[PDB]
Design a protein around this ligand. Structure first.
Ligand SMILES: CN/C(=N\[N+](=O)[O-])NC[C@@H]1CCOC1
Ligand SMILES: CN/C(=N\[N+](=O)[O-])NC[C@@H]1CCOC1
Ligand SMILES: CN/C(=N\[N+](=O)[O-])NC[C@@H]1CCOC1
Ligand SMILES: CN/C(=N\[N+](=O)[O-])NC[C@@H]1CCOC1
Ligand SMILES: CN/C(=N\[N+](=O)[O-])NC[C@@H]1CCOC1
Lengths: 208, 208, 207, 208, 209
């Protein structure tokens, strides 16, 4: 039997945080799912939104796996000990302000879950925010330097209510969230980069 | 007679900052109590408030214990040398600004006390703040990555006064403070994550 | 049958982050290209703009090279493990805010592509911004400490399109972007500092 | 012989940054003295000020001492290489913005002098700011984790001018400064933390 | 038989970044010159100014010196790998925001040039900014912890053009910059601290008559 200290030690022995854990020459399947918590500061003039969301990020790194027979099957681990996907919001206009402890969960099979609460500002369509049908702000997230042969990005469609963790005290409300998968090619390169496009359909709440 | 240096060096060689100090496979029992020192930058339209609180945080790591018959029975220790609970306010919308030195006290029996002064912005019900009944702003605080089997969160056992350390110079006054245990399951997982929900009943001082 | 872990391990052994990778006494040929993504704030009175651009930067560090005949020919690498050109915008009035992960792409032949997305404020000519012919804001980017014999700077004057990646949600639009080679030289010293002058010809949308 | 390089070397290898340098079992005598440099922003509605002060801070760490018969008797040392008292402003509402290089001065006897320029925001009484009487903003500075038996806090006895280095360009002027020894105690515990109360008596300057 | 990597490796082992390289009993002669590039927010009610400037900082460190017979006689070196004067603006009300790569130039005789673009806010006399004769904002720069006998600050005696690099797109224009020298003794300590006073005389462009 190993304790949590032994597991963490074994992870720091086999984890190479600067090396993508591809198996075969297959891409690492990264899942990304936003859970919007708040919409803080909207500007229809400048098409800018300030949003708080939980970024559900899962992937597998088999280098972290251990025997969990008579031992715990999960640990919390600082992300600086692990390879993490180099996700970027393509239409972000501020750095991500990470509000939560920078720890990820690692399961004994090597499945990793990182879920930071992030506050960030985006350039996106705010038109119609004060109308009844709302604005639809599209947020694009994928790897910054890993193309499709290295990272696949995919949404996990089991939306635990679009507006489930969303603050009831926002001035805004969510009408709909659709998370569609997408790709882009840049003439720099022959390569394509996978992204999740997250469409946030929201509006200012009416008054009685 | 061990001196403070000896006490510290023992802690350094034993403490594991990235390893939760569970006993057997029981949860680490963490205690959290917010002393409110100030309410600032209130906004009833956006439902947002800055708060300054001392976040009293107690837990035990019995491996750190020493005999304090002919030696000091407490030392100040930088938190970077200790495991510290990965606490987070679930309805924070800014990262905590830690106003005080990041030092904890380790007692010779293995009890640890970290009490940082934190300024932080929250999304919560600010309605009625200028009325007599006041507003009730609920702050949730618990482990981000450790479920109920790994970390338990409990309010401090005693009900000390609400405005005891509260700036007399604030534009607001506290009417009542209420700390209640709580526990949520999330879409990610079947396990539950414990929190203390602090209910801050406060209002603007009457013009007197 | 080398792998990504080998490639990185070898980079760690050969790479000198603080040492300019000049061959002989020939300058490190650095290529710079700004791709404008957004223009966020413009001030017609103060002559200041807040912009978002991808700064596509390429150079060669031959010490990084490896045989990729039976292994990957490219890896993503943190810039802390590489030497990076000490580029600065001469007319910037804020620190560069790097929005993206700080990883460069390294090719097996030693070629490096670093492409940060950067938000930054600049002091430049905003006159004309509210007219059809628009304003012309020039950004000067070159090495801060390495002269012409040490670093050379050149645009990637390809068939590069202006608004290809530019946000349609900006209140401004790009009319044209020309990136021309230049050299500043500062009164004191017989040392010329090469730069790219990026002329951003833009206007506010609407009548 | 024994040049500055040797002195820095010995400091670096003798210093214990995380261990208080208590001579025998008596508190570390810390001296604190704010010299006000500016009052930037003030708000009489919110009872908040933004001030700039040099924090003259002296104490002794005897282990650092060296023989300066044939060598220098004073060196500048980065505080990161030194034990430094864990001072906090109890009524601070912002992190101390240190404006100067983080170097202290070490004397061959072991006396350390650290004097950072700090810009910081405080919650204090601002009422009267635009009268002849003026306002009196009290600032409390003591150790955050070390009680009376570990750290003692005294104002420096120097009878210096109160406006001496204060900016003539500030919108405000200082009528008087009083720096007074005090302690604070909490209902949790019997231990007392010593502090200086600094009483800033200032007002808005007239055009006349 | 020596390249740039060799020069850096040798600097690393000779260089003591936390040791001022005083020679014998002399102070280290630091010379300081501000090349004003921009003047941003100005507030006359509050007497505060936001300024961008290149802080031309030069000094000698013979520990760094090497033989440049068959090697480069100058390298760019990160400032963390060498000793740097602990300069401070006395009347600054914000941390210096360094806009450029933090690299210094080292010549093989051990002469060091370090010249960050700095953006920083100051408390100084802004009254007059919207007048013909303009405002004069004084910026005092000197060592924070080294006294006259350890560091000396003297203004670059070069007869510089004041607005040589000053943005033509600024709202302000520079009338004059003058750099004097001072030696102040405070209340903590018996020794004197050298400073350069930089008087920046400037005003708004495009005023009437
Ligand atoms: C976002 N655009 C992009 N390329 N491009 O536009 O030519 N990404 C791939 C780059 C490879 C290194 O980091 C980014
Ligand atoms: C200042 N307040 C205090 N107790 N209290 O407020 O009840 N003790 C010192 C704390 C010990 C750990 O960090 C600070
Ligand atoms: C708060 N949300 C949560 N799950 N969820 O929202 O689906 N779990 C906690 C996460 C476990 C790993 O990092 C944090
Ligand atoms: C600049 N001011 C000064 N004294 N004073 O103002 O009373 N001495 C230098 C101090 C020595 C260590 O930190 C700074
Ligand atoms: C770019 N500017 C320059 N001269 N100048 O501005 O007067 N030389 C390079 C300097 C070498 C050290 O830091 C910058």
């Amino acid at each position: 039997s190993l304790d949590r200290a032994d597991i963490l030690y074994n992870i720091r022995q086999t984890s190479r945080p600067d090396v993508i854990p591809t198996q075969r020459d297959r891409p690492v399947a990264v899942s990304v799912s936003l859970k919007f918590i708040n919409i803080l500061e909207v500007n229809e003039i400048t098409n800018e939104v300030d949003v708080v969301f939980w970024q559900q990020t899962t992937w597998s790194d088999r280098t972290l796996a251990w025997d969990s027979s008579h031992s715990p099957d999960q640990v919390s681990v600082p992300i600086s000990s692990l390879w993490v996907p180099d996700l970027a919001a393509y239409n972000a206009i501020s750095k991500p302000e990470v509000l939560t402890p920078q720890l990820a969960r690692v399961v004994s099979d090597g499945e990793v879950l990182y879920m930071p609460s992030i506050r960030q500002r985006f350039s996106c369509d705010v038109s119609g925010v004060d109308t009844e049908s709302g604005a639809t702000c599209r947020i694009k997230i994928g790897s910054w330097t890993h193309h499709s042969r290295e990272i696949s990005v995919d949404p996990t469609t089991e939306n635990s209510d679009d507006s489930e963790y969303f603050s009831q005290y926002s001035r805004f409300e969510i009408l709909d969230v659709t998370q569609k998968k997408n790709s882009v090619t840049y003439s720099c390169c022959p390569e394509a980069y996978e992204d999740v496009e997250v469409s946030l359909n929201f509006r200012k709440k009416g008054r009685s």
